[model samples]
Target: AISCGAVTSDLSPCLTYLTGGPGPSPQCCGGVKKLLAAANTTPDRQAACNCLKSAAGSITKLNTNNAAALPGKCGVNIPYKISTTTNCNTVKF
Candidate 1:
């Protein structure tokens, strides 16, 4: 997942601009799930969690239910709110 995301990041500008969503590849999603599940409750662990969230377009994916618990794991309060835009193509009807 990380590898794919790295490839995507290296080649693509941003996720929403590419996938219309957080742009997590299937492998990336699996890795995220694993990281969340195995997150340890320690200061260093929390820091690692924060570092994880701070990476690429992860914050957007983390806003979802399964991934939403991340902020707590990071030992930091979730911000009041954060927003993202997903570019879309439209055609006149």
Candidate 2:
């Protein structure tokens, strides 16, 4: 479960912001997910959400069976031999 307490207070105001909207660009979602995965910690999740919310950006939902399929929707591929974790580093355009 996503914990409100886990994310930063800065995001509290934007929590209600809809996901997959025009407000956040696709790049933002990719960045948010990357940051969250990198930290892989509750605090980090919150921080990522908070920072992302600050931009008031729109995040569009990508349909996929798993994380591996996420890249194609973003118009890229997983770095060779590099798991999503490390490969995520360069996911941005």
- The TM-score leader among the candidates is 1
Minimum summed lDDT over a 10-residue window in model 1 is located at 84-93
Candidate 1 at residue 69, lDDT?
35
Clash counts for the predictions, in order: 0, 7
List model 1 lDDT by residue over 1-93, tens digit each. 123333333323223322344444443444344443443334433443334344635544333432343233334344423222311111111
Superposed Cα deviation of residue 18, candidate 2 (Å): 12
| Per-model RMSD to reference | 13.9, 10.7
Q: Evaluate model 1: give its lDDT.
A: 0.36
Quote the positional error of residue 14 for candidate 1 in Å: 11
Regions of candidate 2 where Cα sits further than 4 Å from its true position: 1-33, 57-93
lDDT of each: 0.36, 0.38
TM-score for each predicted model, relative to the true structure: 0.31, 0.27
List model 2 lDDT by residue over 6-60, tens digit each.
3333323223323322323454445434434455655544444444443433434
Give model 1's TM-score versus the native structure. Answer: 0.31
Point out where model 1 deviates above 4 Å.
1-22, 53-93
